[PDB]
Write a protein that binds this ligand. Structure first.
Ligand code: NA
Ligand code: NA
Lengths: 205, 204
């Protein structure tokens, strides 16, 4: 009920979509970062043994657990009308989430690898599915009925798009420079449409 | 309205679309593209990726739908297969996310030479497949009903059947004598939707 605790390990990993949803909805939460050396003793206490996870405690001390980051974000976005106003908007929200998920899948391949292997996979996907999936997302952004990803108000599709673009720029600062104008335009409109999210991203840097 | 499902893999990502329409009692048409035809068909598909759904009205106007699970979620939404409440809606998505992880491991073995396929097959069966199966079994016990979420069919039920069939493709005997909640879910699901049972029986 009352207190929402986000348990995670990666600084800007899958938990970013939970935080950005809560911030855009104006809901408070507490960060609980688990460390590498502590994870062996913490894992048996997490249902499913996987992070990130969400812990909810009420006025009375009863603990409710929530698993699977994007499932958690979908629930919080639904509760605050960030999953489309209609069934047709709901589809378009999920359509962009699915495409963002594919781009995130390619980015994830480079994670937790030795320096030489990480460089090899980065070089491979940047010449591969990353530009192909970026063009697909740009077409989905152009088909919007408003200034944001789906319609004119914030939805979950807006948030996971910001998170995955920051992952792309992590692979290459210059990869989007002078290209993909609809992606640059989406972020500018999104910051202008939610000052709380802009406050969150500005202070995070 | 005519629903055309465009796909290439016999039992790929489109299975969740078919099973949703079958459980809802909505008709559709299978349109399988071939490997040698794909070079000429791809420029006609928005996004250039399959599977995709093509909707034609009574007047001939075409509207396209992309991203299989986004299509399935929309069809399940229109026929009340995404949970009756917001809390049930979360429970459907929790199991879909876990099924998605199991499908992600299965996909690594796909469309590779025989020896490479066997090696990756060995790695995930001794790796994340049993770990993710135990997680799915725990979510099945936590349901308030006989199925995956509640007592009526949801999208979580359908994607679970599809991913379990992919597991048995890796190893016919991997679930033999194990994971009783998974065996019990399928048994309850077939009894709870005769159309789906007809679809799976005739498919074999
Ligand atoms: Na995370
Ligand atoms: Na398919």
């Amino acid at each position: 009920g009352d207190h929402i605790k986000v348990i995670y390990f990666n600084g800007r990993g899958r938990a970013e979509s939970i935080r950005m949803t809560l911030v855009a909805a104006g809901v408070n939460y507490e960060d609980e970062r688990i460390s590498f050396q502590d994870w062996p003793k913490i894992k048996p206490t997490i249902p499913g043994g996987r992070l990130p996870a969400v812990k909810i405690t009420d006025n009375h001390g009863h603990v409710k657990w929530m698993l699977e980051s994007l499932a958690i974000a979908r629930y919080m976005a639904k509760k605050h009308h960030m999953m489309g106003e209609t069934d047709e908007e709901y589809y378009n929200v999920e359509k962009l989430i699915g495409q963002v998920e594919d781009l995130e899948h390619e980015y994830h391949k480079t994670l937790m690898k030795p320096e030489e292997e990480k460089q090899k996979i980065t070089k491979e996907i940047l010449n591969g599915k990353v530009p192909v999936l970026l063009d697909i997302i740009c077409e989905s952004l152009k088909a919007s009925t408003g200034k944001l990803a789906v319609g004119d108000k914030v939805t979950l599709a807006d948030l996971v798009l910001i998170a995955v673009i920051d992952h792309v720029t992590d692979l290459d600062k210059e990869f989007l420079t002078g290209k993909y104008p609809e992606i640059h335009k989406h972020r500018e409109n999104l910051l202008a449409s939610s000052p709380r999210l802009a406050k969150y991203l500005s202070d995070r840097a």
